[model samples]
Target: QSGSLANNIKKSTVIVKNATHIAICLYYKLGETPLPLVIETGKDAKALQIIKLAELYDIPVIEDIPLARSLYKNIHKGQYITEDFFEPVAQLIRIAIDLDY
Candidate 1:
């Protein structure tokens, strides 16, 4: 199923948690790393507030469903980047950096 970026952003965040960045939950470093969300939201999950946050903060989101799903399964709030995710997240971060100004 395909949706918009906004839906994914909403799915990735909690109104109460006040998630400002695309990386929510665990905030893993790849270095990175979410808290339920066994579910993964790609660009399809277009959440307005999240999109707005992205705009307001100039944050870049990497839209990878497989990685998002893996992250949901392995990580949680306030955790560090897991060994398994090290390389992939590193790649993801690189992509983000390249995309960034």
Candidate 2:
């Protein structure tokens, strides 16, 4: 119940995390905004739910172990990623844009 992914649907998604260690999910639906709407992370179940949510929504999932780890350290949930990370994170978001989804 706590780790529900039902309402986690979004227009886009980027997954950056290290296996069995840490996970951070950035949910950017659309628009020119640089920050994501949702930053989902967890140990195991939480991480899986984030990934699964992306799948269900047909959102793009970008796996970047290093980026995910770094993001976890700097960002908090429900907040925008700092400007420093815009480019890297944007790279993944760009995929969704190019897809026009």
Candidate 3:
């Protein structure tokens, strides 16, 4: 289970391997503290998993549903954005800002 998402969640982990670390490191060096990044599938089950991870870390999570949907569409070009994929990225931003307050 070590490589499984279930195990990751159980550990209260934040996985940044998929992120653009160069950008994040630059921001960190500039004295800009970046929030931990978690990329989750846009689908409801995955989104809920991300929410649970966020709660465990006590940090805001940006659901990368846009990117997920985009990739999904490219592979299945006819695939349409589901209602579930429309979760607000802005809400995540707002939560992150509020976390600093």
Candidate 4:
């Protein structure tokens, strides 16, 4: 897994959230800190817009409300995820890698 993981570490991972009045989209290359790619508040179809962008880019989008909320709470855009996130995010990257092959 380590070798393959290293091989595909260039893949992009996106996390999306569409809450009542807020929507956020974050993306990062595997092994890199995430970037707050797109954000919308009090806007209609914001989440859908984020999904569409993911489709266009063919990036893997992970929609986990709990994780999303946690990430949003602690991580600022263009910053690294905390150590607590490593395991979950590593699992996500593994899933993405499997899907790619």
Each candidate's lDDT (Cα)? 0.41, 0.67, 0.34, 0.50
Q: For model 3, what is the alpha-carbon lDDT of residue 21?
A: 18
Q: What tens digits encode model 3's per-residue C-alpha lDDT throughout 59-101? A: 4333354444443343231232234423432243434443334
Q: Supply the TM-score for candidate 4.
A: 0.57
Off by over 4 Å in 4: 1-11, 16-46, 98-101
- Report the lDDT tens digits of candidate 1 across residue range 41-86: 2122333455465555444555554665566546653345577866
Off by over 4 Å in 3: 6-42, 63-65, 71-101
Per-residue error at 97 for model 1, in Å?
3.0
Across residues 9-50, which tens digit of lDDT does each residue of candidate 2 receive?
454466666764566767775575556744566657777766
lDDT of 1 at 54: 52
Error of 2 at 31 (Å): 5.6
Q: After superposing candidate 1 on the true structure, give the runs of residues whose Cα lies further than 4 Å from its correct spot.
A: 1-48, 98-101
Give candidate 3's TM-score.
0.30
Best by lDDT: 2
Off by over 4 Å in 2: 1-4, 29-34, 98-101
Provide the clashing-pair count of each candidate structure: 17, 0, 0, 0
TM-score of each: 0.49, 0.71, 0.30, 0.57
Cα-based lDDT at residue 65, candidate 2: 81
